[PDB]
PDB file of C-alpha atoms and ligand atoms in Angstrom:
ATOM      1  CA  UNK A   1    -102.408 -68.291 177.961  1.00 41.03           C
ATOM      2  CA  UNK A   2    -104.947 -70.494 175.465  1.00 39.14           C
ATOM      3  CA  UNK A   3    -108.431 -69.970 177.277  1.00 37.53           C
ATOM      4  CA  UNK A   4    -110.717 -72.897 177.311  1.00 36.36           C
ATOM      5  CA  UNK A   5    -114.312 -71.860 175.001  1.00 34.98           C
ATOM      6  CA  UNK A   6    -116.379 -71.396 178.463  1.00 33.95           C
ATOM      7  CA  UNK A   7    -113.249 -69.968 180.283  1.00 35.60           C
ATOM      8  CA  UNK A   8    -112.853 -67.323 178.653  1.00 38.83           C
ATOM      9  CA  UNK A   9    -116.675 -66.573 177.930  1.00 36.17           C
ATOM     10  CA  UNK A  10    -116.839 -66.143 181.531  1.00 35.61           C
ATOM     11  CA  UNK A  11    -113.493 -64.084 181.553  1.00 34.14           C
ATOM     12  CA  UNK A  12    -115.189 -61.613 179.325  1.00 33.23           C
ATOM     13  CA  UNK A  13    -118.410 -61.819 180.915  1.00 34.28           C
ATOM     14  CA  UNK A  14    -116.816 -61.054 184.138  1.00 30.86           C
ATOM     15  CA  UNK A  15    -114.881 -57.896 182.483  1.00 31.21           C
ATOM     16  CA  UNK A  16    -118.439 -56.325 181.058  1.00 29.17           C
ATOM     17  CA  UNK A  17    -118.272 -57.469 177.452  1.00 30.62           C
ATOM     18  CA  UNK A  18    -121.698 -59.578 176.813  1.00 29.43           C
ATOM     19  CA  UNK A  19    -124.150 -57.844 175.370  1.00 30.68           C
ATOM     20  CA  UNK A  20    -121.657 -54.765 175.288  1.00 30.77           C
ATOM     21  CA  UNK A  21    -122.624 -52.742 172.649  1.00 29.11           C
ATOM     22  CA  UNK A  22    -125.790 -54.939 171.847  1.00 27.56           C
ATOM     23  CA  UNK A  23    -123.063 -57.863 171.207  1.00 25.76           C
ATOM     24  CA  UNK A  24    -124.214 -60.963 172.958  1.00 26.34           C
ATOM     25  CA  UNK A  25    -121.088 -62.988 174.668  1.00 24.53           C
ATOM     26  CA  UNK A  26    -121.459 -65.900 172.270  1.00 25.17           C
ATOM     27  CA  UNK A  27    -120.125 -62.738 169.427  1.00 23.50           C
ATOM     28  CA  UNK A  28    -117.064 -62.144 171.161  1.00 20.74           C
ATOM     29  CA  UNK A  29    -116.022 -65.929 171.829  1.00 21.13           C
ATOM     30  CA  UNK A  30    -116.685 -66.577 168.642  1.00 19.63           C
ATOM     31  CA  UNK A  31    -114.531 -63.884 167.263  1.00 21.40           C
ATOM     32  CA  UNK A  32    -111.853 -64.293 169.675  1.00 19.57           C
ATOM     33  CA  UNK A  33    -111.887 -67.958 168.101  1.00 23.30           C
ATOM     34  CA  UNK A  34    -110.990 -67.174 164.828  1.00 22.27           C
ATOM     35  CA  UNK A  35    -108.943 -64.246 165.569  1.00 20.54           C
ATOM     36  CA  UNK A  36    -106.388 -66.010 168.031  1.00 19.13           C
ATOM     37  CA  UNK A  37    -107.803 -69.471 168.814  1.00 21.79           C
ATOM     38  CA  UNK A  38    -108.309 -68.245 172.251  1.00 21.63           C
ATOM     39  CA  UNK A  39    -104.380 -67.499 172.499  1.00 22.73           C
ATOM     40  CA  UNK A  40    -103.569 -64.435 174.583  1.00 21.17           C
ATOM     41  CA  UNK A  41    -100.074 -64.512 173.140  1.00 24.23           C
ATOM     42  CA  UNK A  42    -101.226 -64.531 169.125  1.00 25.28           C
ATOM     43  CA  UNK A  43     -99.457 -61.690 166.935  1.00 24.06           C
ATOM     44  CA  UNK A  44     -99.886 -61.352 163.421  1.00 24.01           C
ATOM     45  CA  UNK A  45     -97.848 -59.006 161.016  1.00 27.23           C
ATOM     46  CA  UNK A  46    -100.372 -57.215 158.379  1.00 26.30           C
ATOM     47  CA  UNK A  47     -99.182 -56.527 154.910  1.00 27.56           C
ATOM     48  CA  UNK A  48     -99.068 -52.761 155.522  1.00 26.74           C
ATOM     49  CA  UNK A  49     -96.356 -53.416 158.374  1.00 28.34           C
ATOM     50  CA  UNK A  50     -98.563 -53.147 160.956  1.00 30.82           C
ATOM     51  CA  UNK A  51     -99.306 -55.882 163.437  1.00 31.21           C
ATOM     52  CA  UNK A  52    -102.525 -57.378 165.844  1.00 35.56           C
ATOM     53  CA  UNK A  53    -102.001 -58.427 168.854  1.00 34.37           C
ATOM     54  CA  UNK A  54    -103.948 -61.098 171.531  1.00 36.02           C
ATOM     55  CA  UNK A  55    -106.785 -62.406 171.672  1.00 39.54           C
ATOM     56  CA  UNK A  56    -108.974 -59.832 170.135  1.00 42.06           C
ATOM     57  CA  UNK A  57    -106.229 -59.476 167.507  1.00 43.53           C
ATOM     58  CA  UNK A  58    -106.358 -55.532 168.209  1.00 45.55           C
ATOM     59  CA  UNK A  59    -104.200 -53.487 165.263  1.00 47.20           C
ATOM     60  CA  UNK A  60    -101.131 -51.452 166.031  1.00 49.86           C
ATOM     61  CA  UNK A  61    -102.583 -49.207 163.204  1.00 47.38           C
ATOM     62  CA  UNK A  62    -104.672 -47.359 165.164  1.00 47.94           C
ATOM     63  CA  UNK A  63    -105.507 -48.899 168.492  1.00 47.62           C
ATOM     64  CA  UNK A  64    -101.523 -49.993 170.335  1.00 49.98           C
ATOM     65  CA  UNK A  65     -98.370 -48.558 170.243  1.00 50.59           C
ATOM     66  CA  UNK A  66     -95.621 -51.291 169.440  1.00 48.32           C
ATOM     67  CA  UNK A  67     -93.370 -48.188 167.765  1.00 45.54           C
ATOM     68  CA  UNK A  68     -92.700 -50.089 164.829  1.00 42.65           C
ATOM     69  CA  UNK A  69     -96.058 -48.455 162.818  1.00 43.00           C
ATOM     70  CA  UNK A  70     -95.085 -45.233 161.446  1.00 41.75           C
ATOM     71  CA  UNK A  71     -97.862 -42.912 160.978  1.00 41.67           C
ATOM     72  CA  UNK A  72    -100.865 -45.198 163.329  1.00 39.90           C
ATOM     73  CA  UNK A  73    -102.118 -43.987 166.348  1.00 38.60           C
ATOM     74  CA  UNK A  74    -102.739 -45.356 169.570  1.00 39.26           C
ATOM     75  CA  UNK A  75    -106.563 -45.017 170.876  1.00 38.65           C
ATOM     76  CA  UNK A  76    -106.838 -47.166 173.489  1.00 39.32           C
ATOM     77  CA  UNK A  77    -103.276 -45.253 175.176  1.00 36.61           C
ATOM     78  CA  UNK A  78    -101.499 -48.774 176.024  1.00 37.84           C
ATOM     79  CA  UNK A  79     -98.507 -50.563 174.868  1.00 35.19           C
ATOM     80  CA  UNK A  80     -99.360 -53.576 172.310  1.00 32.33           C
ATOM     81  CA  UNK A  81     -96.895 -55.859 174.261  1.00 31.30           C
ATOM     82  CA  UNK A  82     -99.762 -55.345 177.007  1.00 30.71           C
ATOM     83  CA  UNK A  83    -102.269 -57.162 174.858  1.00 28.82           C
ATOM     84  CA  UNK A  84    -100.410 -60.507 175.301  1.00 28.07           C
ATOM     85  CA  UNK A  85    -100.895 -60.289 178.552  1.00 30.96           C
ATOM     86  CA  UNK A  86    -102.488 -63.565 180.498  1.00 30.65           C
ATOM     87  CA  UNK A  87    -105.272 -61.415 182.215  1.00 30.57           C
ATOM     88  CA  UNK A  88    -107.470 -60.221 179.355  1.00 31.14           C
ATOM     89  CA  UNK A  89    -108.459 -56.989 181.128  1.00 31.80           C
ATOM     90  CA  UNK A  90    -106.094 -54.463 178.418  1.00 33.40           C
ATOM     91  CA  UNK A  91    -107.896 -56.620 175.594  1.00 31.90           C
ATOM     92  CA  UNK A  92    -111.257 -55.971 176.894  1.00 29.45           C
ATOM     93  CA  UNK A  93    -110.910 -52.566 177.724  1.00 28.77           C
ATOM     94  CA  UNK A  94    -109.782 -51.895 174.264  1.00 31.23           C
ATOM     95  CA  UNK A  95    -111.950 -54.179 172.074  1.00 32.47           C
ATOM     96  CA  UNK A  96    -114.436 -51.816 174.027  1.00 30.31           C
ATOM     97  CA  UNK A  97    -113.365 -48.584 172.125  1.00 32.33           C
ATOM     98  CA  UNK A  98    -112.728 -50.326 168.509  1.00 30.95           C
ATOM     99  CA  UNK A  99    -116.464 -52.132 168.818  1.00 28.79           C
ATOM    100  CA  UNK A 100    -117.450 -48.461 170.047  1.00 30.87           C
ATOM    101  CA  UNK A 101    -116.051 -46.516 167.076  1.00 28.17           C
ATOM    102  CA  UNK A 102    -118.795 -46.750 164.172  1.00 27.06           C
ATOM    103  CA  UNK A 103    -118.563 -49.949 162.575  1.00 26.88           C
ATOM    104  CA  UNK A 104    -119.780 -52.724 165.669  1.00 27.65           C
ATOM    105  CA  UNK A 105    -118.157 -55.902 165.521  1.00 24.13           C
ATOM    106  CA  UNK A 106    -117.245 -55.229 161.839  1.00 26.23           C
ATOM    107  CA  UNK A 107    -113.607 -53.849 163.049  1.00 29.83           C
ATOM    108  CA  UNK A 108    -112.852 -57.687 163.445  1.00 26.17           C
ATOM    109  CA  UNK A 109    -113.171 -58.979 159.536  1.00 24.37           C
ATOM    110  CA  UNK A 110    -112.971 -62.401 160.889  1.00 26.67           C
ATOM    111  CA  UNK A 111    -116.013 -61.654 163.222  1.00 26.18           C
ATOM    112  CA  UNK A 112    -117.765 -60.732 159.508  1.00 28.85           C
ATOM    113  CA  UNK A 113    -116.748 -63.214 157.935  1.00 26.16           C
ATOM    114  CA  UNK A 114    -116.803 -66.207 160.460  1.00 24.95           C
ATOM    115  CA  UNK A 115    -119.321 -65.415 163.156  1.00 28.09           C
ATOM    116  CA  UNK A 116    -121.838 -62.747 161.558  1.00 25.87           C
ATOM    117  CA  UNK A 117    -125.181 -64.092 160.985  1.00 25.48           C
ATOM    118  CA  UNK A 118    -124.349 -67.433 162.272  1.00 24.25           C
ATOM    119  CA  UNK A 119    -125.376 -69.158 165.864  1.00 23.65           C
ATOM    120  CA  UNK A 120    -123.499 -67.524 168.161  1.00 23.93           C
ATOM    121  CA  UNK A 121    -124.980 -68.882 170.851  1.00 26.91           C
ATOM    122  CA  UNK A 122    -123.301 -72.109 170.444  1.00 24.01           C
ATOM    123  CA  UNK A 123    -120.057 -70.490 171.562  1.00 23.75           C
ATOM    124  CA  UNK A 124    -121.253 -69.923 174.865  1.00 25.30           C
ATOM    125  CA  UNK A 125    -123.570 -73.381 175.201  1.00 25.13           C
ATOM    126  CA  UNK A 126    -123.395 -75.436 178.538  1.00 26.66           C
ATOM    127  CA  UNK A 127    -120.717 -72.764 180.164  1.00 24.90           C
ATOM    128  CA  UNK A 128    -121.552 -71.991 183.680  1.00 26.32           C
ATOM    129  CA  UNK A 129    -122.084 -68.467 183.230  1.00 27.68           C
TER     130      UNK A 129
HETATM  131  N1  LIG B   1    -107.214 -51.243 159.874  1.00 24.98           N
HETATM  132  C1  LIG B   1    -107.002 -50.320 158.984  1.00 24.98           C
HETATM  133  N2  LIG B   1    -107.888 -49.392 158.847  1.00 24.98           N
HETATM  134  N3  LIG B   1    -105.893 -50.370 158.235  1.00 24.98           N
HETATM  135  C2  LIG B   1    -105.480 -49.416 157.219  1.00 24.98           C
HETATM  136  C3  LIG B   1    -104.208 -49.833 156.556  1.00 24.98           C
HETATM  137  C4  LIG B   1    -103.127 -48.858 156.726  1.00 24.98           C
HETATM  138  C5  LIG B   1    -103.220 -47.609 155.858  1.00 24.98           C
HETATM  139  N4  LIG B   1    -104.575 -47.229 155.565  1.00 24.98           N
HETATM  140  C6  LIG B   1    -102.368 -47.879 154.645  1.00 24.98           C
HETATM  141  O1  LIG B   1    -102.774 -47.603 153.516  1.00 24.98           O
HETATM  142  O2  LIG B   1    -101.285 -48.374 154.863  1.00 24.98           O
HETATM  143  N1  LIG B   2    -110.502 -48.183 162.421  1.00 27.71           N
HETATM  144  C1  LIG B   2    -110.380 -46.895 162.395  1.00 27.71           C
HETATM  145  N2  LIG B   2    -110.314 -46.304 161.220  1.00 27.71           N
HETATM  146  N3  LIG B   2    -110.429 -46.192 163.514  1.00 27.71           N
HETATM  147  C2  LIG B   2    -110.270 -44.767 163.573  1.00 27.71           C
HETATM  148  C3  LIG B   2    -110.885 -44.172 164.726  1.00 27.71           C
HETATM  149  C4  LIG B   2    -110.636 -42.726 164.602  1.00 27.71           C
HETATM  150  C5  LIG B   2    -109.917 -42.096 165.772  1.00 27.71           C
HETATM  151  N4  LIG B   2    -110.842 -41.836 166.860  1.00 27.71           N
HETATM  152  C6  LIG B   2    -109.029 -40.935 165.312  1.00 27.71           C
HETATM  153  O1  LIG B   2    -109.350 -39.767 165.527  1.00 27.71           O
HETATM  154  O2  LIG B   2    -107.971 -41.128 164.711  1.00 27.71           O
HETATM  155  N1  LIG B   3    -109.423 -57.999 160.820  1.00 28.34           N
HETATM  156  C1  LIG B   3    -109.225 -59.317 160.949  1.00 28.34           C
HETATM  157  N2  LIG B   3    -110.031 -59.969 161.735  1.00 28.34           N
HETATM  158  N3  LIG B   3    -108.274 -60.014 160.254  1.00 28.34           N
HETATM  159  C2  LIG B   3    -108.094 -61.526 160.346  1.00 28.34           C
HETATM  160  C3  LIG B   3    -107.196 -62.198 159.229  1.00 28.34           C
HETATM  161  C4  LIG B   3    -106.024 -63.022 159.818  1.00 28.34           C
HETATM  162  C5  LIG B   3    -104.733 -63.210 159.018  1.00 28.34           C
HETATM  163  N4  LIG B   3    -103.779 -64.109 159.676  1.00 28.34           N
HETATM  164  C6  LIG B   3    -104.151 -61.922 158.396  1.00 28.34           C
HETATM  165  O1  LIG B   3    -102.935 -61.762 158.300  1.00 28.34           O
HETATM  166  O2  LIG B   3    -104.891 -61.075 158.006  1.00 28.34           O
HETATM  167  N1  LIG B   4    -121.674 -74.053 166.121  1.00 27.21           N
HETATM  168  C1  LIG B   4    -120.383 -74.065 166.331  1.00 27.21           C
HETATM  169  N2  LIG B   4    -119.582 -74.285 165.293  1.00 27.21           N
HETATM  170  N3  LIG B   4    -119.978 -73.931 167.586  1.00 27.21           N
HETATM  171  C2  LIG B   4    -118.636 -73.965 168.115  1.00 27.21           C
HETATM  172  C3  LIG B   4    -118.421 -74.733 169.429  1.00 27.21           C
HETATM  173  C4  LIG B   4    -119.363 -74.365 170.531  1.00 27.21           C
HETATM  174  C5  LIG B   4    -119.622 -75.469 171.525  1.00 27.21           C
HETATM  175  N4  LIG B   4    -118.696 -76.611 171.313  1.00 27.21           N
HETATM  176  C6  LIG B   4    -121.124 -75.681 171.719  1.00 27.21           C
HETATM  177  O1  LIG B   4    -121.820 -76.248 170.916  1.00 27.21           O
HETATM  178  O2  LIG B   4    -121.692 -75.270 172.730  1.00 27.21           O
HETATM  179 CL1   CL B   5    -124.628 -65.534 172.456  1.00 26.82          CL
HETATM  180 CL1   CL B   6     -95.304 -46.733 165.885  1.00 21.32          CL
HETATM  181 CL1   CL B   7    -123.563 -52.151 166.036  1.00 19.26          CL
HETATM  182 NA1   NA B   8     -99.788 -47.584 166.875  1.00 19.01          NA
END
């Protein structure tokens, strides 16, 4: 599924994510932007042979299992595959631990370097939310 900018704003609203973890909304549109383009199916092989997944772009490293990632772990105790899915709910749930685990919104290097610092806000402008 490609989410519309307010669509999935209030998707993620609706699953507890604005202001989660002091992160306004307009944060996690904004990253989900850059990460995927708002494309729940979006996979991306890293250069270590790991892979991210959805819309969050969530790392087999240490957060899915996709049992193609020798060594990683998986934190958030779900298959990657699940992370494609249409309903956003695995993504959320997840993005939840990895924004929970020490370094904030960080995790996502896009988030850094696209959305940090910049107005946020207009991610989430005019939505009915
Ligand atoms: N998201 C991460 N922390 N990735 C670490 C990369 C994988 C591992 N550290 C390696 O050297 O292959
Ligand atoms: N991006 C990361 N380095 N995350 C690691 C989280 C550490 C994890 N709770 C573990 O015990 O393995
Ligand atoms: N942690 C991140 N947000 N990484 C985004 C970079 C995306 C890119 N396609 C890659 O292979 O790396
Ligand atoms: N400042 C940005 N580059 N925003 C991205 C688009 C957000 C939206 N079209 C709005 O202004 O409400
Ligand atoms: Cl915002
Ligand atoms: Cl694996
Ligand atoms: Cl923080
Ligand atoms: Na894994």
């Amino acid at each position: 599924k490609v989410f519309g900018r307010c669509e999935l704003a209030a998707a993620m609203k609706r699953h507890g994510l604005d202001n989660y973890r002091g992160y306004s909304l307009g944060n996690w549109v904004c990253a989900a932007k850059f990460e995927s383009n708002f494309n729940t199916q979006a996979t991306n092989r890293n250069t270590d042979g790991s892979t991210d997944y959805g819309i969050l772009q969530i790392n087999s490293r240490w957060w899915c299992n996709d049992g193609r990632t020798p060594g990683s772990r998986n934190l958030c105790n779900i298959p990657c595959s699940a992370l494609l899915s249409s309903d956003i709910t695995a993504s959320v749930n997840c993005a939840k631990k990895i924004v929970s685990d020490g370094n904030g919104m960080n995790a996502w290097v896009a988030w850094r370097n696209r959305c940090k610092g910049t107005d946020v806000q207009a991610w989430i402008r005019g939505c009915r939310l």
